Write a protein that binds this ligand. Sequence first.
Ligand code: SF4
Ligand code: SF4
Ligand code: SF4
Ligand code: SF4
Ligand code: FES
Ligand SMILES: [Mg+2]
Ligand SMILES: [Mg+2]
Length: 578
Amino acid sequence: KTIIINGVQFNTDEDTTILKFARDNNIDISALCFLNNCNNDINKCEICTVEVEGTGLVTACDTLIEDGMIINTNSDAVNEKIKSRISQLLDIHEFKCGPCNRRENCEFLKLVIKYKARASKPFLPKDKTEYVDERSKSLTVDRTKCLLCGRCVNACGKNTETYAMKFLNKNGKTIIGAEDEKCFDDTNCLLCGQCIIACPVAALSEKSHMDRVKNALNAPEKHVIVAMAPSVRASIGELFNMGFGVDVTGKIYTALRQLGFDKIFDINFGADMTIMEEATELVQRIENNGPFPMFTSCCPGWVRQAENYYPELLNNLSSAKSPQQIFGTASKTYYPSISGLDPKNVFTVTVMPCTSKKFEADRPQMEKDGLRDIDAVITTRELAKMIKDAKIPFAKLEDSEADPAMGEYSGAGAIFGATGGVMEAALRSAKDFAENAELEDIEYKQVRGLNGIKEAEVEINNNKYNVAVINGASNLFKFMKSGMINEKQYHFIEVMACHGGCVNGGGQPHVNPKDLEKVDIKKVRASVLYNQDEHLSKRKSHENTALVKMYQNYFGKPGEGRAHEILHFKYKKSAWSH
Ligand code: SF4
Ligand code: SF4
Ligand code: SF4
Ligand code: SF4
Ligand code: FES
Ligand SMILES: [Mg+2]
Ligand SMILES: [Mg+2]
């Protein structure tokens, strides 16, 4: 068919929207509420307005192209409409970009500038108490920024299928929030933060821990440990104009030292620990025959999903603590034993791509003798802001190393941040443990990739077992509801709340819709992790020399005695009541 756009003739056969056809042909059309192939069906922002000859003004983001169409995207009538919509949004938006946390990458600000729009009356409330919800340990809402674009609502539905984020009618006004306007933590919400990643403005944010950290750094008697997650070294560089998929590991260690942290360790070291305990546990359940299947328990998003939707599976979860929590436990016990520090004075901080990790760290029972496993969790975004505030030229920094005692990590622990990572890492150790050997081929590419549900047959000690990798909370629901759990006998299953793995977590850097269609962010970030695994001398968790001497000198045998006593954590369904 034939269509005219701004005087240019196109002969196409494709059946698609005006917006996406224009994007494919270097024609600029603005958009706001359109994301993940969905717009706000109930309250269209109409930023994507174009003019179709013979019809009038139409929304390009949900209008299909058709033969005989003559389209104009930059007429005066079009621009007047768009500018008007942005103006109306400014009438309900506290326009103070100064101290805003989305100052450097806000979609709305760029639209205001582009169309040079202004408010009819500047929205200025001098008491944001009614507009702000900070009850959650993971999420925060500022409704002075909310455009009601519904992107959070759609994102939650598609990613989790919980629909925990909803449109609400608060006193006759329309808002977004949790069920019955409750605290998110008190609902079926997973605290995965996918609603944040979809937010075009600073309406949705993580619960800040930056004050916890700064007060600890300035406390004379406090010894502050810092340790980053796998995905951070593959991501944070984006917020310093370094592009995508840049390994900035060495730069982070340097920046963390200039920030004043007293010790530089790594969560990947803790990931090797989780494997030591979990791989041991897998071999245990084999010889004891069950309980099968065993589910991973390192994702607090999936834990909450199980607790809220599938409590009968809680006993099937691995007792091994998550890399963050298992690391923290050792930071307050093992680390003082080799440093002389008073355990009370140790302050453990982690850097995560995750908002759910905040809720996990503040779990009441996640402590021992009054000492928290983890005292503070800051996101990838929070660390980046901390660096810029201290005016540290991150991009120019020289590479340094972490402190080895709890900083060394194998390639197995390095790939934790990608879907199927824990699965593969665990099989590298579990296979050696059961067969009592040191195998050569350790790459399980069948469990890798962005497929929603991934299963494979593996052979452990002359016997075949079935494993599965659930990629995204929505795929867990699919996996269970469709009855795939019963089709065959599974023995070991990985579950991750965020599709793509932790590299796509809720605490990660925002990426505008434009770059997302250009870049496979989930694969580009993950590639950094796998590339480290390929070049590392040690590619098995139990070959981690620093970890070996820790177990030899302090803990003992994994899955036994002391190691089982303090490095493990069991979830149990609530007892019967009425
Ligand atoms: S949300 Fe965006 S436009 Fe609004 S104050 Fe913050 S940076 Fe400025
Ligand atoms: S919180 Fe963000 S994504 Fe949700 S409606 Fe408001 S502006 Fe849109
Ligand atoms: S944190 Fe996750 S589950 Fe909770 S509302 Fe946001 S997207 Fe939905
Ligand atoms: S997949 Fe990773 S980032 Fe996402 S909720 Fe789970 S632990 Fe957090
Ligand atoms: S982007 Fe088309 S209606 Fe919002
Ligand atoms: Mg629609
Ligand atoms: Mg200090």
